[PDB]
Amino acid sequence: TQQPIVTGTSVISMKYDNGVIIAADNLGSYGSLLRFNGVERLIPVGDNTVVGISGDISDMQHIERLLKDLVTENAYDNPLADAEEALEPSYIFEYLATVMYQRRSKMNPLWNAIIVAGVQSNGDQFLRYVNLLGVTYSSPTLATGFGAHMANPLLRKVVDRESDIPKTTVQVAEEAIVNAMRVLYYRDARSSRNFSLAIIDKNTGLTFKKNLQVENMKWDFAKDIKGYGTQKI
């Protein structure tokens, strides 16, 4: 028993040639009430990892605190905490996947769908998903909720398999992400125009972009639409 109250919608992501991109809009919905508008659902952990969370926002806030406590705990008695023994994306993920699976097993889930994005210390891109059931999987593209249905097909047109990854630039990947965010804004009734986007590059590091907006929207064609069948005026 448990049910989500305040929620966040899609988290979408993909691998490009040198890293990962992840985005989520800034809305906290309360059923059909678009209740909160400055909600950050991208959580940087160190400078190699961003965790994207959708689902229940109270559980998201709980997971934020777990992530922060994990940075604290790793720094304890660790002279290499900002070098060789810094938290890796894969460490953060395995931790979360453990928590998620334990909580579902106790019949008390964290009502979330989570994407961990980042770069390993050897330069490898890391992109993995975990949800309220402890189900985990990895793919060149990952998305949650509506993003799964609508962003993935668009993103998969760019990175359809492993070999497509060396062929994909930051510019191309970000363009695809930004476009998929527009599509989501067109068709998801729980989406917002404002979103955050983060790039984690093996050369550039972490670029966190706040207060992005869907631009270049097509609405003009609406004027020609009259009635629902026979009506002419």
């Binding site: 008695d77 290499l80 023994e85 894969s90 460490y91 993920f93 395995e94 453990t98």
Partner: protein, 233 residues
């Protein structure tokens, strides 16, 4: 001053000494010698195994803790079993939860904290075993020395047990040479067998006598006994 002050680990002497701890320290000196040393690429344990009789096995001094970590023992052997099992569990927990190999340094801290609790609890005794811990983690080769007082120190080389003062002086003398035996397992082991020799009023070291272990850059922790040590005698 030593009279009424050594009945338990929960009493300080008027000098500020804990005699039960000091007595536990004394069981290590009663133990058969073992040597540890490392270069930048490998770490080696060398141990003199001891038989009860000429009809008997020679008792094991080396225990594997994980693929990248193991230890040698001097003192109460059943205490080494208790502490290595704990260490195996800590190694395990780290892999399962965080997908992370336990830092040799953290293994040191965990052993220290465990020993400490027994130097302060009524009804219990301190551990009566010294341990030498080798491993290869994300910052290379490591050697540790554990005293059941809870003091753990990181060293390039060391020895514990009866007559170990010889081997220690030897290593102290050879420091600049063995630290640089990189990429050569056989030379590093040779220098370890060399070191344990300075601790023999015993005799010649035989094929039943000798126990060697190695871990390193591309070598999991591995124990050599019997016929497999002959090429070092």
């Amino acid at each position: 001053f030593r009279n009424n002050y050594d009945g338990d680990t929960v009493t300080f002497s008027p000098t500020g000494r804990l005699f039960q701890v000091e007595y536990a320290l004394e069981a290590i000196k009663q133990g058969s010698v073992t040597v540890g040393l490392r270069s930048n690429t490998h770490a080696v344990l060398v141990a003199l195994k001891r038989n009860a009789d000429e009809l008997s096995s020679y008792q094991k001094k080396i225990i594997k803790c994980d693929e990248h970590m193991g230890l040698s023992l001097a003192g109460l052997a059943p205490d080494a079993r208790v502490l290595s099992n704990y260490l195996r569990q800590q190694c395990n927990y780290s892999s399962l939860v965080f997908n992370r190999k336990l830092a040799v340094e953290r293994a040191g801290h965990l052993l220290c904290d465990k020993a400490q609790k027994n130097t302060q609890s009524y009804g219990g005794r301190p551990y009566g075993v010294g341990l030498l811990i080798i491993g290869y983690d994300k910052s290379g080769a490591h050697l540790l020395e554990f005293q059941p007082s809870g003091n753990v120190t990181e060293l390039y080389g060391t020895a514990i047990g009866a007559r170990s003062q010889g081997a220690k002086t030897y290593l102290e003398r050879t420091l600049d040479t063995f630290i640089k035996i990189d990429g050569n397992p056989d030379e590093l082991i040779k220098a370890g067998v060399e070191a344990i020799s300075q601790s023999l009023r015993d005799e010649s070291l035989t094929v039943d006598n000798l126990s060697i272990a190695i871990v390193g850059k591309d070598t999991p922790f591995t124990i050599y006994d019997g016929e497999a040590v002959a090429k070092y005698i």
